């Protein structure tokens, strides 16, 4: 079951990563709309950077989860 907890956790992390990515794609399009009307306020850009930072972190944990899975299947 140790692998079963990891496999379910991996599924949880993967779904979370996809939702965040979908959120970033939507938010980035909106920032483009804001730029087109010349209303950028800096905070919208900061929100996109924060999202990228969170996404990079999520990808790193997914890789760590793969390492735990590999270490347990040898």
């Amino acid at each position: 079951s140790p692998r079963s907890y990891l496999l379910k956790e991996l599924a949880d992390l993967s779904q979370h990563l996809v939702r965040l990515l979908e959120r970033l794609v939507r938010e980035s399009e909106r920032v483009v709309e804001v730029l087109e009307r010349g209303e950028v306020d800096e905070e919208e850009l900061k929100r996109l950077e924060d999202l990228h930072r969170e996404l990079e972190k999520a990808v790193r944990e997914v890789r760590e989860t793969h390492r735990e899975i590999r270490e347990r299947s040898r």
Binding site: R3, A11, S14, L17, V32, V40, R70
Partner: protein
């Protein structure tokens, strides 16, 4: 019979597509910070991002189904 390896290989392939999406989004963000005069490239990055995200969702959903099948 490489059950775990198949899942990991599929996940790694998915991560490569996700990193491609992140790279596309990073170019878009870097361009936006510089206030470009033209939005043709950024609009194209958004269009490509939507295509890649759709494929990422389909692959992830499939991998999640497989992960649940194996864990039983």
């Amino acid at each position: 019979e490489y059950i775990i390896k198949d899942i990991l290989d599929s996940q790694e392939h998915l991560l490569r597509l996700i990193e491609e999406l992140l790279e596309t989004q990073k170019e878009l963000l870097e361009i936006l910070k510089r206030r470009p005069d033209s939005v043709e490239r950024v609009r194209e990055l958004v269009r490509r991002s939507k295509e890649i995200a759709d494929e990422i969702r389909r692959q992830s959903d499939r991998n999640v189904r497989l992960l649940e099948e194996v864990s039983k």
